[PDB]
Amino acid sequence: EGMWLMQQLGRKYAQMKERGLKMKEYDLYNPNGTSLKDAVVLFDGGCTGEVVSDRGLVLTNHHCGYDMIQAHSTLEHNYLENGFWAMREADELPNKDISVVFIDKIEDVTDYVKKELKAIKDPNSMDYLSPKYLQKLADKKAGKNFSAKNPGLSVEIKAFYGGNLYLMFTKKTYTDVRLVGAPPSSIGKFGADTDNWIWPRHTGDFSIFRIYADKNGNPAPYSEDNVPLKPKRFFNISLGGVQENDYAMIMGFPGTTHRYFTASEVDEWKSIDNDIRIRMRDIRQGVMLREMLADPQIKIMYSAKYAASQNAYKRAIGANWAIKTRGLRQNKQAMQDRLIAWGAKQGTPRYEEAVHEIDATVAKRADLRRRYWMIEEGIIRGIEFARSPIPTEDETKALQASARKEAIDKIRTRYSKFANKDYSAEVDKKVAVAMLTEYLKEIPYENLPLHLRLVKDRFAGDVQAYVDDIFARSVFGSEAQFDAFAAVPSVEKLAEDPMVLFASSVFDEYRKLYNELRPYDDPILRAQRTYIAGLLEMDGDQDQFPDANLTLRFTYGQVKGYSPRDNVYYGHQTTLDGVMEKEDPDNWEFVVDPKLKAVYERKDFGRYADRSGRMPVAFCATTHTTGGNSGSPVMNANGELIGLNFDRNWEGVGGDIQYLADYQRSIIVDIRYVLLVIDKVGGCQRLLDEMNIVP
Amino acid sequence: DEGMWLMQQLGRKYAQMKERGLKMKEYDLYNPNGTSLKDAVVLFDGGCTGEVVSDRGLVLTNHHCGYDMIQAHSTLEHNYLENGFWAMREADELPNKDISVVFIDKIEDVTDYVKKELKAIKDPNSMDYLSPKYLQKLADKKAGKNFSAKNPGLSVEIKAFYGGNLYLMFTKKTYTDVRLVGAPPSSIGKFGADTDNWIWPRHTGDFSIFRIYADKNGNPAPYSEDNVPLKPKRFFNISLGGVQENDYAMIMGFPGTTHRYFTASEVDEWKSIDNDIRIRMRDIRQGVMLREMLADPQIKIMYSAKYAASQNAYKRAIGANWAIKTRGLRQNKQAMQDRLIAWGAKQGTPRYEEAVHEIDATVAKRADLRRRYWMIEEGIIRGIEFARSPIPTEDETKALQDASARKEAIDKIRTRYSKFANKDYSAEVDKKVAVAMLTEYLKEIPYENLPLHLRLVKDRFAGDVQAYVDDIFARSVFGSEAQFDAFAAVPSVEKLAEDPMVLFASSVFDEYRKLYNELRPYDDPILRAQRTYIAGLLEMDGDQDQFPDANLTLRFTYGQVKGYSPRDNVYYGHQTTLDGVMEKEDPDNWEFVVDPKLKAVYERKDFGRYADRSGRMPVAFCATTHTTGGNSGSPVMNANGELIGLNFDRNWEGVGGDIQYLADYQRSIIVDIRYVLLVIDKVGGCQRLLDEMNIVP
Ligand SMILES: CC(C)N(C)S(=O)(=O)N1CCO[C@@H](C)C1
Ligand SMILES: CC(C)N(C)S(=O)(=O)N1CCO[C@@H](C)C1
Ligand SMILES: [Cl-]
Ligand SMILES: [Cl-]
Numbered sequence A: 001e002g003m004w005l006m007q008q009l010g011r012k013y014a015q016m017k018e019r020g021l022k023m024k025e026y027d028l029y030n031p032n033g034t035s036l037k038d039a040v041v042l043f044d045g046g047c048t049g050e051v052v053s054d055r056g057l058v059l060t061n062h063h064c065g066y067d068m069i070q071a072h073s074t075l076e077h078n079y080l081e082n083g084f085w086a087m088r089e090a091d092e093l094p095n096k097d098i099s100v101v102f103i104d105k106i107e108d109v110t111d112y113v114k115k116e117l118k119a120i121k122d123p124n125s126m127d128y129l130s131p132k133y134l135q136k137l138a139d140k141k142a143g144k145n146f147s148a149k150n151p152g153l154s155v156e157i158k159a160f161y162g163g164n165l166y167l168m169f170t171k172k173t174y175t176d177v178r179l180v181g182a183p184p185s186s187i188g189k190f191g192a193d194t195d196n197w198i199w200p201r202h203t204g205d206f207s208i209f210r211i212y213a214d215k216n217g218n219p220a221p222y223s224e225d226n227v228p229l230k231p232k233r234f235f236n237i238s239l240g241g242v243q244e245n246d247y248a249m250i251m252g253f254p255g256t257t258h259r260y261f262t263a264s265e266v267d268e269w270k271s272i273d274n275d276i277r278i279r280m281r282d283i284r285q286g287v288m289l290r291e292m293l294a295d296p297q298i299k300i301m302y303s304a305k306y307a308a309s310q311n312a313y314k315r316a317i318g319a320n321w322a323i324k325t326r327g328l329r330q331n332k333q334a335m336q337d338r339l340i341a342w343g344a345k346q347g348t349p350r351y352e353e354a355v356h357e358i359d360a361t362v363a364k365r366a367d368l369r370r371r372y373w374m375i376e377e378g379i380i381r382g383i384e385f386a387r388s389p390i391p392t393e394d395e396t397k398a399l400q401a402s403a404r405k406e407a408i409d410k411i412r413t414r415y416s417k418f419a420n421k422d423y424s425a426e427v428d429k430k431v432a433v434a435m436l437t438e439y440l441k442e443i444p445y446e447n448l449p450l451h452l453r454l455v456k457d458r459f460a461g462d463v464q465a466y467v468d469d470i471f472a473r474s475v476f477g478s479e480a481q482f483d484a485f486a487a488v489p490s491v492e493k494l495a496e497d498p499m500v501l502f503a504s505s506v507f508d509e510y511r512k513l514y515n516e517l518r519p520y521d522d523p524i525l526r527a528q529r530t531y532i533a534g535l536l537e538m539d540g541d542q543d544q545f546p547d548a549n550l551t552l553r554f555t556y557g558q559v560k561g562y563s564p565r566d567n568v569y570y571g572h573q574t575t576l577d578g579v580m581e582k583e584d585p586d587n588w589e590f591v592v593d594p595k596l597k598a599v600y601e602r603k604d605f606g607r608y609a610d611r612s613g614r615m616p617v618a619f620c621a622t623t624h625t626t627g628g629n630s631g632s633p634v635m636n637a638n639g640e641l642i643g644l645n646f647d648r649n650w651e652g653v654g655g656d657i658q659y660l661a662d663y664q665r666s667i668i669v670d671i672r673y674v675l676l677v678i679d680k681v682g683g684c685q686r687l688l689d690e691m692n693i694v695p
Numbered sequence B: 001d002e003g004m005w006l007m008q009q010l011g012r013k014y015a016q017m018k019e020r021g022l023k024m025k026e027y028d029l030y031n032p033n034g035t036s037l038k039d040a041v042v043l044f045d046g047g048c049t050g051e052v053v054s055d056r057g058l059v060l061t062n063h064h065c066g067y068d069m070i071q072a073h074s075t076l077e078h079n080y081l082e083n084g085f086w087a088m089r090e091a092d093e094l095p096n097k098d099i100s101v102v103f104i105d106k107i108e109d110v111t112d113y114v115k116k117e118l119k120a121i122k123d124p125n126s127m128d129y130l131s132p133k134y135l136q137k138l139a140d141k142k143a144g145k146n147f148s149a150k151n152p153g154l155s156v157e158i159k160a161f162y163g164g165n166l167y168l169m170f171t172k173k174t175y176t177d178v179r180l181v182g183a184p185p186s187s188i189g190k191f192g193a194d195t196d197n198w199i200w201p202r203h204t205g206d207f208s209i210f211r212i213y214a215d216k217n218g219n220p221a222p223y224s225e226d227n228v229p230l231k232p233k234r235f236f237n238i239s240l241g242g243v244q245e246n247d248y249a250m251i252m253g254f255p256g257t258t259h260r261y262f263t264a265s266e267v268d269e270w271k272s273i274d275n276d277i278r279i280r281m282r283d284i285r286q287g288v289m290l291r292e293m294l295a296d297p298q299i300k301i302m303y304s305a306k307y308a309a310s311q312n313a314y315k316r317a318i319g320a321n322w323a324i325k326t327r328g329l330r331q332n333k334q335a336m337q338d339r340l341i342a343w344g345a346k347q348g349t350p351r352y353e354e355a356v357h358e359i360d361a362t363v364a365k366r367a368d369l370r371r372r373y374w375m376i377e378e379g380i381i382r383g384i385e386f387a388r389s390p391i392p393t394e395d396e397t398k399a400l401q402d403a404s405a406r407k408e409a410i411d412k413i414r415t416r417y418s419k420f421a422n423k424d425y426s427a428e429v430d431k432k433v434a435v436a437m438l439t440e441y442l443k444e445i446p447y448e449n450l451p452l453h454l455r456l457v458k459d460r461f462a463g464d465v466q467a468y469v470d471d472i473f474a475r476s477v478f479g480s481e482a483q484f485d486a487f488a489a490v491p492s493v494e495k496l497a498e499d500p501m502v503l504f505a506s507s508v509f510d511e512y513r514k515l516y517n518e519l520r521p522y523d524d525p526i527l528r529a530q531r532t533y534i535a536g537l538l539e540m541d542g543d544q545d546q547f548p549d550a551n552l553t554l555r556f557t558y559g560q561v562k563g564y565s566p567r568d569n570v571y572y573g574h575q576t577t578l579d580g581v582m583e584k585e586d587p588d589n590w591e592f593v594v595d596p597k598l599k600a601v602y603e604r605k606d607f608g609r610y611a612d613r614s615g616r617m618p619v620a621f622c623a624t625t626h627t628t629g630g631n632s633g634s635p636v637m638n639a640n641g642e643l644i645g646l647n648f649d650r651n652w653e654g655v656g657g658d659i660q661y662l663a664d665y666q667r668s669i670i671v672d673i674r675y676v677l678l679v680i681d682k683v684g685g686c687q688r689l690l691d692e693m694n695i696v697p
């Protein structure tokens, strides 16, 4: 059920041992010594990774190392499509802007932070959650020249439990992290977007990196003189596999959860956030799909934009399914009613006052939040010409010196980036007509961005005419229209341009709504500090975990499938046979790598197949994970690596608010499948040889 | 693999059935010389199965089987199709015109008699051995002089089995006064609607209730207010004990057709011609139709039924091609024929190998013609609505060329034009469908093989299909209402003779008939070779584990209540529940609306004695019985012969089961009798129907 702090391992250890954990507590996490925790990294700011060799080899997801694989891909060596396998360490590719973070030490600094906070005076101060304020406290505690006396090391203080607990992290950051191996995208991204959030899953979602450092193992930026890192700890690879009900545990960096939402916040999340995102994205995607299916050239230009819109659309559908069917609202209502009854018995009304302040803030910001999501989903991300060029103050105060030619070159560069090889003005006019028709039906005239008032006032309610006019008269409506403006540029032409006025008008409303809504966050945050303090004082810190905040957490559960619906059971494990069942050579998402298909036909599974002779691919577990847990190590009862977490089923996405024991699962790529691909597909034996593989 | 056995085969199967769980005595299930459970099974309205469930002639069948009767009695004031129907007294049961129920009174093996009569061979290539006219002359000769007059209600029929190696005579008793008694609302009767057709898990309460009426002596009689309910020889007892995984289950019914003795070349032909063309052409047709229906709500109303009708055999062809691709159907037919050929070589008889060779040679020779036939049938005949536009008859053209018969000819042509261009016809949607369908057709069928009018695409329109179609509608008398009325005011034979739509329709129907007539002669050598082929198969491996092909005659099948794994890591259990109906509820999707009375029964758990041991309300179950079209409405029996459900569908993964039974995928989809009784009770409130049934604890 939870995403536990490392400090909470002592308190959960007996429950974990009862659930099957065999390793000693301090071998998993030791606050004053080397432990398994030391082999876990924050990979490139938002993923998790793990050290799997004494030479700094790192495993993470294919989708986590995707940008690095793509940056090294060319028409001559397309690593994204064919995979990449460095046959020697010297052939491993450096990556600019990459990092791996080790959590060297973790310390509870609650009393220190709370004592420092007593000097505030203003009760409503938000310094208790300020990264700038907490960094000044972290620097004071670590010392004046800490990073100079301890190179590669840095300190950070974070708030937990709404500001009721503070931890200081000492981090070791390495920035020379090289690409070592990757399967082809047909394996690494087998499901592609069709299987995203889906279980059963048949994706070999892994990539391999290596941490490099100076001669002493200290962090150093890229240098040809850097040597592989010999770490304090690395994971042993298990080849024993998994069976149903086996104990499994994960360490990683879950980003965000909302476990302490009031019932009113669940209602708001459903009725505003999710319903607007679902309604607006379905309109956008519907027009886009019609156009992509009618023209193969439109499919090429819009495939990535369509897939990017679908990802959070599916998340919102899964989240709304949980609100509708798993009683999330009701369970938050029961959680807050229990605290209110306990507060009434203790003679302390502050918990009931805190829940009331959250409800009153939610109810007061309702119309504004609705207007914000409507413009963000409907226009800001819904219509491409909302992000068309807006001339700066510097650019107009140049057009009306020879700096007129420089202003036009800057505007031209932005026009060329908006109307790029993937932009269709015709598809965008169609999407805008459907999106604005919905937007104009939902947002009253007095609440519209100023330019949108022209639909009723100037165009007699004809949205199609309004959109046609924007393109017909705008300097960004076509290449010929821009070039005619660029030849004779007037600031009066730009100031009256229908597309400039639309873009300016919608961004002005988006910012005015953002600025008006920002003040409502603070009373809710302040009330949550009191609310969570009451919850913890009443039921304790065990069963109720602190919300995820991109910090190192552990979660434990079992390898177990689930029943998605009446008479249907999804087991705990998928096989290579499932990849072959899904093969469709004329659908790019489900093409099968010929070397992999041959391994399957010949049953060349070696030491990686299960006892039945079947090749496993992926498994699922009752661990509690979220975004940020991509690439996380999945451990055995003995702490040996059995897989990498890479996704979670859509039925469990409401698990960020309420864990769903009968539906929520972490989707994990089996480590045996990872090794079979490195071995029989990549032929990269040296990587197998440097890992410590246990029989 | 698993079969559809003749009643005659119950004796030789009985010990296997008993070891698989059957508890009832052989002659209680079927007895050729007495009353048995076979006497409670009926052929319902020519193509469904039904069963008698009371001593007062009450009959259960599917909702989709009694659908036309429920619809014929529905009005805006009493919409029985939508709200259900529950006659609260026998006098309130509604008569139905053109309905029938057929009882299989006697079944007799007449093989020796038919084979002796056949020896009077004028031609050794005669097809009389399979002729309904010839076999009826033999049935009439055996039954006697005016048998129908001496035994009113009874009739005799002889059918060929095993490709003409076995003949059975059936004595049938037909009743034509069959009244509507009860039906759930369509939201229960067709809950999955087209989305869940061929789908397991399934949550549909697919049942309807009728009653057989007869004269005072229980003899068949057409509808009369003086008719009384039939007291039958036998009826099914209803079980409330339910089902559990691995329980024995058996069915009796009338499966229509199978192709269990196809050669490997016939499987290849079925895949590469029949199925690939139907799939390719229907996907083009459906794709254009769906885009138009999604862009215009009025087009969705007009084309929903045509779209759904096209999809049904399209999904069947996809499921059948999945089996050919993944279950080795071709290979298993090849192994079946190679084994017979090896055994024939050892026996010194080359006739079996010669028979398989004749089938292969006939299949290979008719390939181009059969491809051209399926291409025109799927592509144009079925694919394009203006192919079925009016064609003036020889008598209509003669009437137009000096009498009052001119206005008679115009009124007949007008009636046909009005039926073609009806409230559901869109000329614009049809032009779009025709442009996509003809583009595919013209790419597949060479110029010299085209219907004559289609040659104008290359010759007159420079290959522009859109211009050719636009021209058909712009210049045709049937292109619009105003164009027809202008023709009707000044009709000339010459206008009709040069009409582009008339020429298109005539041209495509001429080619369709020429292909049909050229292909028909190839059926006979295959049929004659199959008589020898199946004779060899039976002489070699016996009439024990190879059943005769289905031919709309009474058969039994047995298996177990068991689910299956459709794909890697996915398991579909053997039983669905009322919770599955509630999970599927979508009030703004007509297919998945839930009846408010049913939703209340679920919320209150008002399941009575109908719920399972765990308090869950069962809906449907699936079994390893071997069924096909014609088995809708079939009784599903317990090990004791008690009714446990009604068969109503089969999963798409098992549709290849008409050629090769698929033990790990093929299932019969059955509505649980506990759910039927729950709906009659808590939804219909029709207690009298429960009271007349014999319900066993
Ligand atoms: C194949 C596509 C079109 N979908 C039906 S889906 O399975 O991806 N589905 C996953 C989650 O529920 C929906 C939001 C979409
Ligand atoms: C998109 C898919 C999942 N279908 C809804 S389907 O109706 O096309 N399909 C159902 C399974 O059996 C096939 C023969 C047809
Ligand atoms: Cl380290
Ligand atoms: Cl012979």
Ligand SMILES: [Cl-]
Pocket: B327, B661, B662, B663, B664, B665
């Ligand atoms: Cl099978």
